[PDB]
Enzyme design. Structure first.
Site, PDB file in Angstrom:
ATOM      1  CE  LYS A 138      16.522  47.371  39.789  1.00 31.69           C
ATOM      2  NZ  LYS A 138      17.503  46.267  39.610  1.00 31.69           N
TER       3      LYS A 138
ATOM      4  CG  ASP B 250      30.922  -9.265  31.380  1.00 30.51           C
ATOM      5  OD1 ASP B 250      30.819  -8.421  30.450  1.00 30.51           O
ATOM      6  OD2 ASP B 250      30.056  -9.420  32.259  1.00 30.51           O
ATOM      7  CB  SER B 251      35.281 -14.357  29.853  1.00 33.11           C
ATOM      8  OG  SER B 251      34.645 -14.995  30.948  1.00 33.11           O
ATOM      9  CD  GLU B 252      38.902 -11.712  24.261  1.00 37.85           C
ATOM     10  OE1 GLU B 252      39.019 -12.852  24.760  1.00 37.85           O
ATOM     11  OE2 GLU B 252      39.753 -11.222  23.485  1.00 37.85           O
ATOM     12  CE1 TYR B 253      37.891  -3.986  30.149  1.00 37.79           C
ATOM     13  CE2 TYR B 253      37.478  -5.274  32.127  1.00 37.79           C
ATOM     14  CZ  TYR B 253      37.903  -4.105  31.530  1.00 37.79           C
ATOM     15  OH  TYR B 253      38.333  -3.082  32.319  1.00 37.79           O
TER      16      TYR B 253
ATOM     17  CD  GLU C  64      23.466  14.167  41.575  1.00 41.61           C
ATOM     18  OE1 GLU C  64      22.925  13.351  42.350  1.00 41.61           O
ATOM     19  OE2 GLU C  64      23.816  15.315  41.920  1.00 41.61           O
TER      20      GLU C  64
ATOM     21  CE  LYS D 291      17.151  17.329  42.431  1.00 39.43           C
ATOM     22  NZ  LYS D 291      17.753  16.481  43.480  1.00 39.43           N
TER      23      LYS D 291
HETATM   24  C1  LIG Z   1      24.421  23.099  37.131  1.00 37.63           C
HETATM   25  C2  LIG Z   1      22.934  23.098  37.495  1.00 37.63           C
HETATM   26  C3  LIG Z   1      22.136  23.553  36.268  1.00 37.63           C
HETATM   27  C4  LIG Z   1      22.703  24.140  38.601  1.00 37.63           C
HETATM   28  C5  LIG Z   1      22.602  21.685  37.990  1.00 37.63           C
HETATM   29  N1  LIG Z   1      22.871  21.451  39.266  1.00 37.63           N
HETATM   30  C6  LIG Z   1      22.577  20.238  39.752  1.00 37.63           C
HETATM   31  C7  LIG Z   1      22.929  20.068  41.178  1.00 37.63           C
HETATM   32  N2  LIG Z   1      23.784  19.236  41.732  1.00 37.63           N
HETATM   33  C8  LIG Z   1      23.842  19.453  43.091  1.00 37.63           C
HETATM   34  C9  LIG Z   1      23.076  20.447  43.565  1.00 37.63           C
HETATM   35  S1  LIG Z   1      22.208  21.187  42.285  1.00 37.63           S
HETATM   36  C10 LIG Z   1      22.012  19.192  38.935  1.00 37.63           C
HETATM   37  C11 LIG Z   1      21.622  17.820  39.214  1.00 37.63           C
HETATM   38  N3  LIG Z   1      21.778  17.302  40.476  1.00 37.63           N
HETATM   39  C12 LIG Z   1      21.093  17.029  38.170  1.00 37.63           C
HETATM   40  C13 LIG Z   1      20.759  15.657  38.425  1.00 37.63           C
HETATM   41  N4  LIG Z   1      20.516  14.557  38.580  1.00 37.63           N
HETATM   42  C14 LIG Z   1      20.966  17.540  36.850  1.00 37.63           C
HETATM   43  N5  LIG Z   1      20.473  16.776  35.854  1.00 37.63           N
HETATM   44  N6  LIG Z   1      21.294  18.788  36.542  1.00 37.63           N
HETATM   45  C15 LIG Z   1      21.797  19.593  37.519  1.00 37.63           C
HETATM   46  N7  LIG Z   1      22.099  20.851  37.087  1.00 37.63           N
HETATM   47  C1  LIG Z   2      35.096 -10.746  35.250  1.00 35.42           C
HETATM   48  C2  LIG Z   2      34.365  -9.520  34.770  1.00 35.42           C
HETATM   49  C3  LIG Z   2      34.967  -8.626  33.904  1.00 35.42           C
HETATM   50  C4  LIG Z   2      34.293  -7.522  33.434  1.00 35.42           C
HETATM   51  C5  LIG Z   2      32.984  -7.263  33.833  1.00 35.42           C
HETATM   52  C6  LIG Z   2      32.239  -6.066  33.290  1.00 35.42           C
HETATM   53  N1  LIG Z   2      32.947  -5.391  32.186  1.00 35.42           N
HETATM   54  C7  LIG Z   2      32.835  -5.878  30.906  1.00 35.42           C
HETATM   55  C8  LIG Z   2      33.380  -5.272  29.818  1.00 35.42           C
HETATM   56  C9  LIG Z   2      33.171  -5.946  28.500  1.00 35.42           C
HETATM   57  N2  LIG Z   2      33.686  -5.369  27.429  1.00 35.42           N
HETATM   58  O1  LIG Z   2      32.450  -6.958  28.386  1.00 35.42           O
HETATM   59  C10 LIG Z   2      34.113  -4.056  30.083  1.00 35.42           C
HETATM   60  C11 LIG Z   2      34.256  -3.576  31.339  1.00 35.42           C
HETATM   61  C12 LIG Z   2      33.676  -4.238  32.476  1.00 35.42           C
HETATM   62  O2  LIG Z   2      33.785  -3.857  33.643  1.00 35.42           O
HETATM   63  C13 LIG Z   2      32.358  -8.139  34.737  1.00 35.42           C
HETATM   64  C14 LIG Z   2      30.994  -7.857  35.313  1.00 35.42           C
HETATM   65  C15 LIG Z   2      33.063  -9.262  35.169  1.00 35.42           C
END
Ligand SMILES: CC(C)(C)c1nc(-c2nccs2)c2c(N)c(C#N)c(N)nc2n1
Ligand SMILES: Cc1ccc(Cn2cc(C(N)=O)ccc2=O)c(C)c1
Length: 317
Positions: free
Chosen positions: A315, A32-35, A174, A116
């Site tokens: 249908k 993390d420090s190198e980054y 998400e 989910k």
């Molecule tokens: C595009 C669709 C196939 C309808 C869909 N929708 C959602 C949603 N996101 C918000 C409301 S439904 C999903 C969702 N919230 C997740 C999660 N976690 C997921 N794995 N797949 C989702 N897939």
């Molecule tokens: C100070 C510091 C810098 C970076 C990070 C986390 N981290 C690390 C890397 C890495 N390649 O290791 C890349 C992106 C990033 O967000 C933390 C928690 C603390």
């Protein structure tokens, strides 16, 4: 050519690659420090030579100025909802109906099974590999412009990790807050006499509604991509798992618990495995999302418009 433009290009490429390794692969090749050493070396150099500063550089995630309000964005492709099930028998009936409804039923019927997550659905647009816009799901048709907020999320790349990115790619996922981040936030908010959050979902929601991206940046938010909206200038894989693997291979975070299961009984084993692992994931989930893996079979089955669960039109041939 200048030495400055070159060392900025090299720092950026190295930093984006380390962010991928750390965030997407969960296998950082450096400490993390190198980054950080290289990060604040890029930041200083950019500030000493601001003519070479780029909008998608790893140092430009947080807006210096809080916003006045969120603009509204109409999604080009609407964001659909999910059907739900509450039992093994109910899940089996959903599968038996697909089996009957399909023209040709393949043996096996493969499902892409995923946790989910209990978060906020978002849409992120990449134009020629660059992050240009991000929106909340809203009502599935219209949402809010949260680009500045999404840009602060550490595991969200400001540019796709590919030399041939699509003309346009809309990533759907998400946004959520893991348990450790949620616990630290509430401990900090308590010790600073501020608003505590009842659950990680509420903390993620409140963080994305924040107008000041400087506060959103202090919120430990994570994206997990589940789908694709707009996809122009690319031939997407013909299975849903391969599309998630493709997203992952170009720098997008996807959940690592995703599996392929053949038939309902395998799919139900996955559901029971995620239910038992639930106590050890480090983030909240409320179920499993089970999808037909073959894209041609998804297109065949199509979608159902807002309709009652208590009626059906049988249908005639
Ligand atoms: C595009 C669709 C196939 C309808 C869909 N929708 C959602 C949603 N996101 C918000 C409301 S439904 C999903 C969702 N919230 C997740 C999660 N976690 C997921 N794995 N797949 C989702 N897939
Ligand atoms: C100070 C510091 C810098 C970076 C990070 C986390 N981290 C690390 C890397 C890495 N390649 O290791 C890349 C992106 C990033 O967000 C933390 C928690 C603390």
């Amino acid at each position: 050519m200048t030495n400055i433009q070159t060392q900025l290009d090299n720092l950026r490429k190295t930093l984006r690659q380390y962010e991928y390794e750390y965030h997407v692969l969960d296998n950082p090749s450096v400490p993390d420090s190198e980054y950080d050493r290289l990060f604040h070396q890029l930041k200083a150099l950019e500030l000493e030579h601001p003519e070479f500063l780029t909008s998608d550089s790893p140092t430009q995630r947080v807006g210096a100025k809080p916003l006045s309000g969120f603009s509204q964005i109409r999604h080009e492709i609407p964001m659909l909802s999910l059907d739900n099930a509450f039992s093994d028998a109910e899940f089996n009936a959903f599968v038996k109906r697909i089996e009957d409804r399909l023209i040709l039923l393949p043996k096996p019927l493969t499902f892409c099974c995923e946790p989910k997550l209990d978060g906020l659905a978002v849409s992120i647009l990449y134009v020629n590999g660059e992050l240009t816009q991000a929106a909340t799901r809203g009502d599935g048709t219209t949402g809010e412009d949260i680009t500045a907020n999404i840009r602060t999320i550490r595991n969200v790349p400001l540019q796709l990790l590919t030399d041939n990115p699509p003309a346009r790619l809309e990533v759907r996922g998400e946004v959520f807050m893991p348990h450790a981040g949620f616990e630290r936030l509430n401990k900090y908010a308590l010790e600073h006499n501020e608003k505590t959050f009842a659950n990680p979902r509420n903390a993620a929601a409140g963080s994305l509604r924040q107008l000041d991206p400087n506060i959103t940046s202090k919120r430990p938010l994570v994206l997990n991509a589940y789908g694709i909206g707009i996809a122009e200038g690319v031939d997407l894989p013909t299975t849903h798992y391969a599309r998630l693997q493709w997203l992952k291979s170009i720098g997008i975070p996807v959940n690592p618990e995703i599996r392929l299961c053949n038939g309902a009984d395998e799919v139900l084993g996955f559901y029971r495995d995620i239910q038992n692992k639930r106590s050890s994931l480090g983030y909240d989930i409320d179920g499993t999302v089970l999808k037909i893996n073959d894209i041609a079979l998804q297109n065949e089955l199509g979608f159902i418009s807002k309709a009652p669960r208590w009626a059906i039109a049988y249908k005639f041939p």
